[PDB]
Design a protein around this ligand. Sequence first.
Ligand SMILES: *[C@@H]1O[C@H](CO)[C@@H](O[C@@H]2O[C@H](CO)[C@@H](O[C@@H]3O[C@H](CO[C@H]4O[C@H](CO)[C@@H](O)[C@H](O)[C@@H]4O[C@@H]4O[C@H](CO)[C@@H](O[C@@H]5O[C@H](CO)[C@H](O)[C@H](O)[C@H]5O)[C@H](O)[C@H]4NC(C)=O)[C@@H](O)[C@H](O[C@H]4O[C@H](CO)[C@@H](O)[C@H](O)[C@@H]4O[C@@H]4O[C@H](CO)[C@@H](O)[C@H](O)[C@H]4NC(C)=O)[C@@H]3O)[C@H](O)[C@H]2NC(C)=O)[C@H](O)[C@H]1NC(C)=O
Ligand SMILES: *[C@@H]1O[C@H](CO)[C@@H](O[C@@H]2O[C@H](CO)[C@@H](O[C@@H]3O[C@H](CO[C@H]4O[C@H](CO)[C@@H](O)[C@H](O)[C@@H]4O[C@@H]4O[C@H](CO)[C@@H](O[C@@H]5O[C@H](CO)[C@H](O)[C@H](O)[C@H]5O)[C@H](O)[C@H]4NC(C)=O)[C@@H](O)[C@H](O[C@H]4O[C@H](CO)[C@@H](O)[C@H](O)[C@@H]4O[C@@H]4O[C@H](CO)[C@@H](O)[C@H](O)[C@H]4NC(C)=O)[C@@H]3O)[C@H](O)[C@H]2NC(C)=O)[C@H](O)[C@H]1NC(C)=O
Ligand SMILES: *[C@@H]1O[C@H](CO[C@@H]2O[C@@H](C)[C@@H](O)[C@@H](O)[C@@H]2O)[C@@H](O[C@@H]2O[C@H](CO)[C@@H](O[C@@H]3O[C@H](CO[C@H]4O[C@H](CO)[C@@H](O)[C@H](O)[C@@H]4O[C@@H]4O[C@H](CO)[C@@H](O)[C@H](O)[C@H]4NC(C)=O)[C@@H](O)[C@H](O[C@H]4O[C@H](CO)[C@@H](O)[C@H](O)[C@@H]4O[C@@H]4O[C@H](CO)[C@@H](O)[C@H](O)[C@H]4NC(C)=O)[C@@H]3O)[C@H](O)[C@H]2NC(C)=O)[C@H](O)[C@H]1NC(C)=O
Ligand SMILES: *[C@@H]1O[C@H](CO)[C@@H](O[C@@H]2O[C@H](CO)[C@@H](O[C@@H]3O[C@H](CO)[C@@H](O)[C@H](O)[C@@H]3O)[C@H](O)[C@H]2NC(C)=O)[C@H](O)[C@H]1NC(C)=O
Lengths: 160, 215, 216
Amino acid sequence: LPKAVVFLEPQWYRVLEKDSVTLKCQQWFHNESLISSQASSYFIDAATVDDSGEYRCQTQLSTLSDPVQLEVHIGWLLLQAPRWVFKEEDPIHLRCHSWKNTALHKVTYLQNGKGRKYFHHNSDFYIPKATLKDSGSYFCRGLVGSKNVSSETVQITITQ
Amino acid sequence: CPAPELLGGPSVFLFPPKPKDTLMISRTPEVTCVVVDVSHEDPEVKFNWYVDGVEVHNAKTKPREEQYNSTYRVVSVLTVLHQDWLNGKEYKCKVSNKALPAPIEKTISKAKGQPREPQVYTLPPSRDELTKNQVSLTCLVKGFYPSDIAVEWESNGQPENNYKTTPPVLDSDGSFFLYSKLTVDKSRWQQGNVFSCSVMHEALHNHYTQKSLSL
Amino acid sequence: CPAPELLGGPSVFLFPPKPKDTLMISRTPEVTCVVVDVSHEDPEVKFNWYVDGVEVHNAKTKPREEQYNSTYRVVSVLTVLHQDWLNGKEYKCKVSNKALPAPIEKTISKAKGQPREPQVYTLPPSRDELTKNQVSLTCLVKGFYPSDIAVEWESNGQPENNYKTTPPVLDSDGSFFLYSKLTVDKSRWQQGNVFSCSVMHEALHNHYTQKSLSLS
Ligand SMILES: *[C@@H]1O[C@H](CO)[C@@H](O[C@@H]2O[C@H](CO)[C@@H](O[C@@H]3O[C@H](CO[C@H]4O[C@H](CO)[C@@H](O)[C@H](O)[C@@H]4O[C@@H]4O[C@H](CO)[C@@H](O[C@@H]5O[C@H](CO)[C@H](O)[C@H](O)[C@H]5O)[C@H](O)[C@H]4NC(C)=O)[C@@H](O)[C@H](O[C@H]4O[C@H](CO)[C@@H](O)[C@H](O)[C@@H]4O[C@@H]4O[C@H](CO)[C@@H](O)[C@H](O)[C@H]4NC(C)=O)[C@@H]3O)[C@H](O)[C@H]2NC(C)=O)[C@H](O)[C@H]1NC(C)=O
Ligand SMILES: *[C@@H]1O[C@H](CO)[C@@H](O[C@@H]2O[C@H](CO)[C@@H](O[C@@H]3O[C@H](CO[C@H]4O[C@H](CO)[C@@H](O)[C@H](O)[C@@H]4O[C@@H]4O[C@H](CO)[C@@H](O[C@@H]5O[C@H](CO)[C@H](O)[C@H](O)[C@H]5O)[C@H](O)[C@H]4NC(C)=O)[C@@H](O)[C@H](O[C@H]4O[C@H](CO)[C@@H](O)[C@H](O)[C@@H]4O[C@@H]4O[C@H](CO)[C@@H](O)[C@H](O)[C@H]4NC(C)=O)[C@@H]3O)[C@H](O)[C@H]2NC(C)=O)[C@H](O)[C@H]1NC(C)=O
Ligand SMILES: *[C@@H]1O[C@H](CO[C@@H]2O[C@@H](C)[C@@H](O)[C@@H](O)[C@@H]2O)[C@@H](O[C@@H]2O[C@H](CO)[C@@H](O[C@@H]3O[C@H](CO[C@H]4O[C@H](CO)[C@@H](O)[C@H](O)[C@@H]4O[C@@H]4O[C@H](CO)[C@@H](O)[C@H](O)[C@H]4NC(C)=O)[C@@H](O)[C@H](O[C@H]4O[C@H](CO)[C@@H](O)[C@H](O)[C@@H]4O[C@@H]4O[C@H](CO)[C@@H](O)[C@H](O)[C@H]4NC(C)=O)[C@@H]3O)[C@H](O)[C@H]2NC(C)=O)[C@H](O)[C@H]1NC(C)=O
Ligand SMILES: *[C@@H]1O[C@H](CO)[C@@H](O[C@@H]2O[C@H](CO)[C@@H](O[C@@H]3O[C@H](CO)[C@@H](O)[C@H](O)[C@@H]3O)[C@H](O)[C@H]2NC(C)=O)[C@H](O)[C@H]1NC(C)=O
């Protein structure tokens, strides 16, 4: 009966190369294999694209966990969210994550090609109350030094 | 060298008056202070204006305008006295906003250096061009400084509808030249219409001269 | 100078060949990939070059140059074939450096759109200028496309170098024009010497035309 579930610290499943991740098991299977350590939590110090893919876990007292996909991306900026589909009135938490947490300023989160929120210094964009109007393709952008950089887009969909 | 950059807040751009505005008394020259990347959280912007260091008032500050990218843009326009600008007085725009560690100051003023009077010469079309439906009338303006200038083509008291002027180019003696090309139907040329190249510059009498050109 | 922060890592600028170089076969046209804001700590730049997506290996690698602001400027120069450039092939410079999350790719090719032949018109000095000790010989070049062009002056088989030429100016029909101004001693003009404006452009026959001007 007692199954297993994996949990990421921080929660972002889309990460950037060089990001630290911590996977929580509630033995480890990377793309269905093993690992150098069957400790409690698997720790990735500095992600690379090979760290991407599928993770399951399992303990002496608990069965094989569900599949948990980790995407490791390459780029200056990555728009992170806990997921990409939301119910009306759901809270939407977006983070414009910069490579190596390099200082990012004059940050804009865009929806469907239009600036939606602007910040002088990098901040997350938190929508407390999702509505149908929140559907569309998002990306963020900003200045690292004098260099103007943008993330790839992500599609957010809102369901009733 | 000492350029650790201001990073993360509103930015200021300070624009000069148009040359023709500074030169003709029937026009009103303005210096323009533009502030961009004003956030909605701290949208209040204060303008201070200094002429040679003497705070002035009577600047006209427009209401903030929301941009497509969801920032605010705010503009302040200071009317300038023709002779003030030409005498090389300095105009300083100071910008205060809560998101700025320190207010931002920008200065502008006319380019410096000994003013030099343009020579103006009109050149008819080359004979080889007389073969086309349209012909080129050329106005050469050279020897001028500073590079600020206005050039127009006219006929019978009205502006001509089809001319382009090159940017000023630095000659070897430190002065500038340019050419202005007026294009007219061949018929107009050969019927002996009179066309005029008009030039306005700091260093001309009445800030104005014109030269004519006709078959 | 104390080194700048360079939070963004290096930046790349990719430059086309000189117009003349692409036009005269005896000349060597080059594309130039320039990388600036290269830091002292991560100063190595790796260049890959592609022509229409196919890698080529003949690039020349220049020694890095210290800038006043305590960065390096680092350059790779690729010689191109005259006809490839003129035929619109795309040149891609890919730049790799440790301060960057991924390579920077820049591409360059000739401006697109129907080429148009320049008309070249020489104009003698104004009667009014003839009171000066030096006079202006004018070469008007109009109706060309693309804007890539070279203009020089000659007399009696010898180069005349005392000239200035304006940048190309976009005209109202979508073509470009420019003026070149050769300044000569009046006595040389009065003697009856023939001066020539030489124009090189892809849409001219043999990439070359010449118009002459003298006392009449
Ligand atoms: C959100 O959206 C915002 C708006 O869309 C966007 O705002 C833009 O931000 C840009 C910077 O991030 C800013 O870029 C600057 O632009 C300067 C030129 O601006 C003129 O030209 C533009 C197009 O060519 C126009 O779009 C501009 O509106 C502006 O146009 C001029 O406007 C003035 C005043 O309105 C007007 O003069 C007045 O006209 C009236 C008649 O109407 C009267 O005659 C008045 O008397 C007269 O005063 C002009 O006619 C008009 N000119 C036109 C249209 O041609 C440009 O100069 C800046 O470049 C310098 O600074 C940057 C630093 O960012 C350097 O990288 C660059 O190399 C330049 O550096 C300077 O170089 C100088 C010369 O060598 C040197 O002297 C300086 O030392 C040096 N350093 C400086 C100056 O710091 C720069 O590109 C742009 O203007 C903003 N757009 C608008 C519409 O305001 C914002 O960024 C967005 N935010 C986000 C987060 O995305
Ligand atoms: C530390 O110090 C560093 C050194 O000073 C400094 O580096 C400078 O950084 C600047 C950016 O920060 C950079 O600025 C760019 O300049 C571009 C043009 O540069 C040419 O002209 C300059 C003077 O005007 C020269 O100083 C440059 O060297 C360069 O000169 C050209 O060099 C080439 C190659 O050598 C040469 O061609 C080759 O010649 C050889 C023979 O010598 C052979 O014949 C070969 O066959 C041939 O290939 C040229 O002849 C030579 N030209 C001249 C005149 O000498 C300029 O284009 C850039 O502007 C674009 O990008 C900016 C964004 O930054 C935009 O704001 C701007 O609007 C332009 O945008 C472009 O617009 C185009 C038109 O529509 C469009 O098509 C493009 O898509 C668009 N591009 C983009 C990206 O949007 C820019 O201003 C400067 O070059 C650097 N200096 C040097 C020496 O490298 C560094 O920044 C300092 N760092 C700090 C932190 O302080
Ligand atoms: C960081 O970089 C990004 C990207 O920068 C850019 O890309 C790089 C590679 C470089 O090439 C840069 O040079 C280039 O800018 C920066 O973001 C860019 O910022 C600029 C400046 O703000 C924007 O240009 C302006 O766009 C606005 C908005 O127009 C949109 O909305 C219209 C509908 O209302 C629509 O019709 C437009 O098409 C456009 O929407 C989209 O535009 C993109 C273009 O990329 C297009 O592909 C899409 O199809 C289209 N659709 C959608 C859904 O988005 C526009 O208003 C501005 O025009 C003004 O200025 C013009 C010249 O300056 C002028 O001719 C115009 O008239 C107009 O000015 C006013 O016009 C009105 C009437 O129209 C008139 O009444 C006023 O008098 C007049 N006022 C003045 C003062 O002139 C201008 O075109 C870029 O769009 C934007 N790019 C992107 C991809 O977002 C970013 O800002 C940088 N910095 C930071 C910190 O992020
Ligand atoms: C676990 O499985 C995942 C997903 O199948 C693997 O991710 C993949 O990793 C490969 C190799 O690193 C990536 O290949 C890349 O392809 C591009 C071509 O577009 C190539 O140019 C690069 O050089 C690179 O090889 C691939 O993109 C990536 N796929 C995804 C969806 O992320 C992962 O490698 C596996 N992990 C282990 C330890 O085997």
